[PDB]
Amino acid sequence: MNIFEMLRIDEGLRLKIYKDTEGYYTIGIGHLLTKSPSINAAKSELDKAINAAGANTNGVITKDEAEKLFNQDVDAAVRGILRNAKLKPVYDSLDAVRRAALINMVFQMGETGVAGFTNSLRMLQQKRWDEAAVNLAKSRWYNQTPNRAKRVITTFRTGTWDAYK
Known part of the structure; x- marks a missing residue:
């Protein structure tokens, strides 16, 4: 086993935005997007990281992109x-x-x-x-x-x- 699998399990892989253990807009494998309760905010930092690493991102994301x-x-x-x-x-x-x-x-x-x-x-x-x-x-x-x-x-x-x- 290795650190990546360890976290994969401990974090799960969700392609759509979800709430942290603390309820923060997180996505993918434990990637926090914003501590702000704003839904549109998440998608902002989200779209930010996605079309960066002319499409958009409404909560959803693609594996390996995660x-x-x-x-x-x-x-x-x-x-x-x-x-x-x-x-x-x-x-x-x-x-x-x-x-x-x-x-x-x-x-x-x-x-x-x-x-x-x-x-x-x-x-x-x-x-x-x-x-x-x-x-x-x-x-x-x-x-x-x-x-x-x-x-x-x-x-x-x-x-x-x-x-x-």
Whole structure:
């Protein structure tokens, strides 16, 4: 398995605009378009990214057009991670599988969002899986999206893809 499939599952692939876990106008594979409650707004940032990467876009989108955005979003993640000091070191000390569990997190709540987990990051640098996997268990992250949190924690705690079999 790999980070792309991991998120594909954890995000799903919807070609028409949908609402985030928080109800933000998102599309494709977890690609947020706008936090604004405006429907036309989404389609604006949408059409923006689509006929860019004389047609339009009314909620709908085409696969691989969604995978183009997904591919960047993910890279932009690894970029966010390396540009942040709290995250670059952790990310660098982790194995193939665990690097993906962090990429996932930054993907879901952004660079600085996953940079806030200061303690769980320490535990992770010291390769204290179980201890770090229990620490992450306490946070709005886990509280708000436990199913997602359970899979990523598991991945951190075991270093395997068991939660995604």
